[PDB]
């Protein structure tokens, strides 16, 4: 159950948001 | 006419041709209309700045380690001390992090040789001042408190000031023309199996651990102005020398530890939401 990321850290296109710097 | 053919020869039949080799001959059948047609690299081709060999990747500078140097560090004190073995970073503990290009690529080979280059970048300003001595020590190692033992080896003293960087070629001085890798040639353990002596006894080989060390000691104590920081970080870069050599392809000692997911059948395996 990891088929898409949570909405807090994502840009519509179901990828890591450019705003969310803490991903690293 | 139908005359007989008397020509003949003895042959040794093999199932594959050039199966082990990376170059030479091949008996590969092209899945094409034209059997001798190939991919065109007229427009789309490899860029000229891209590395062509493993040695080209080893010539890229990579940040190996870091250490702090303060005004409290008395003269003769070891700021830096490591066994410089490109096979393994540690012999007595697990590693996890961003390994340098030359270490990554050396992990693919059973043998290495030639000098190793280091570069020490001092993260400072013009108001920082001091002196350190870099030393390459072979066979016999120095005591932590005995600076004189380090001074008797192959050394380079750097006067920190306006210049905030120094290069250091580590000579290759060993009893053999090449050194074998301290990592394993083959390791079938995949599920973090709890090791015993019987497992070690039935290993692929024996780890010939290096005693060759690079150290950095204080010559003149760091004496910065009151207006700036009393402690600075020093970045230690590493790469293979111009005559760095690698040989004997093996199982890679390093493997990705972050964001590793195996492929599945798309779209059969529940892609249709």
């Amino acid at each position: 159950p990891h088929r898409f990321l949570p909405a807090n850290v994502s840009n519509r296109w179901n990828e890591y948001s450019s705003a969310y710097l803490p991903r690293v | 006419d139908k005359p007989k053919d008397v020509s003949s020869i003895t042959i040794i039949p093999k199932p594959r041709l050039g199966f082990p080799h990376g170059k030479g001959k091949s008996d590969a059948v092209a899945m094409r209309v034209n059997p001798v047609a190939l991919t065109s690299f007229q427009d789309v081709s490899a860029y000229p700045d891209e590395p062509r060999t493993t040695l080209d990747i080893a010539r890229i500078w990579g940040l190996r380690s870091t250490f702090n140097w303060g005004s409290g560090d008395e003269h003769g004190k070891e700021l830096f001390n490591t066994v410089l073995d490109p096979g393994l970073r540690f012999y007595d503990q697990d590693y996890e992090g961003q390994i340098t290009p030359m270490e990554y690529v050396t992990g693919l080979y059973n043998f290495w040789s030639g000098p190793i280059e280091l570069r020490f970048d001092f993260v400072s300003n013009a108001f920082h001042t001091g002196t350190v001595i870099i030393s390459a020590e072979y066979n016999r190692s120095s005591t932590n408190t005995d600076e004189c033992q380090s001074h008797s080896t192959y050394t380079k003293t750097f006067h920190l000031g306006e210049q905030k960087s120094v290069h250091f070629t580590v000579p290759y001085i060993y009893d053999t023309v090449v050194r074998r890798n301290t990592a394993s040639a083959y390791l079938p353990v995949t599920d973090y199996d709890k090791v015993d002596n019987v497992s070690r006894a039935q290993a692929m080989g024996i780890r010939a651990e290096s005693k060759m060390r690079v150290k950095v000691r204080v010559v003149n104590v760091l004496r910065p102005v009151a207006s700036t920081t009393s402690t600075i970080e020093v970045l230690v870069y590493m790469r293979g020398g111009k005559n760095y050599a690698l040989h004997g392809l093996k199982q890679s000692t390093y493997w990705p530890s972050n964001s590793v997911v195996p492929i599945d059948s798309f779209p059969p395996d529940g892609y249709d939401p």
């Binding site: 890591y16 450019s18 | 427009d43 860029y47 961003q98 970048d121 920081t229 970045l235």
Partner: protein, 199 residues
Amino acid sequence: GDLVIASSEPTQQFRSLTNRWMPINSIRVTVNGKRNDLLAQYYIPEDFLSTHAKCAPNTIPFETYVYGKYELEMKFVANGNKFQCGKVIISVKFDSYQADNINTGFQAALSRPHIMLDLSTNNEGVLKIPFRYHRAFVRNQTHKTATAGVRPGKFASIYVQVLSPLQTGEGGANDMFIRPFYRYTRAEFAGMSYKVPLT
């Protein structure tokens, strides 16, 4: 090579608009920042169209043309005092779509095309970005009528990362600022259409 085949009609340049320097958002570096931390990151051209410098005349041709090839140049200007010290690294990752979260460390940055900024000396750095993409063109804009099968406006990623943390003296400033500027060295546009607002 692929340009003449991919587009039957000729491609166009607008150097007066695109090949000028344009500043983007300011970057803050603090003493709290550790090595490997992302200070900023940019998916290009997307982020230079619809987030940073949105009213720039550099963005005007992207309104009408659907495709293009893009080579960029990015200048970085830092302003820390002489009693500070630190190292920042800026690097580029080509065709980064769904591969931003891997090979994204300081070590990967040192391998890829990059520039290094010392925070005390305030040396300027200029990284050159060629067009290295798995297709002939990159798509400029999404649209309601357009397909969602191809994610547009991203052929590369830029990362600004801490190499060595910012340090300061007793009663000194706990932060300092860096300003990026961008320009297209070679922006060729293809496939004319009706003008639309950017994102």
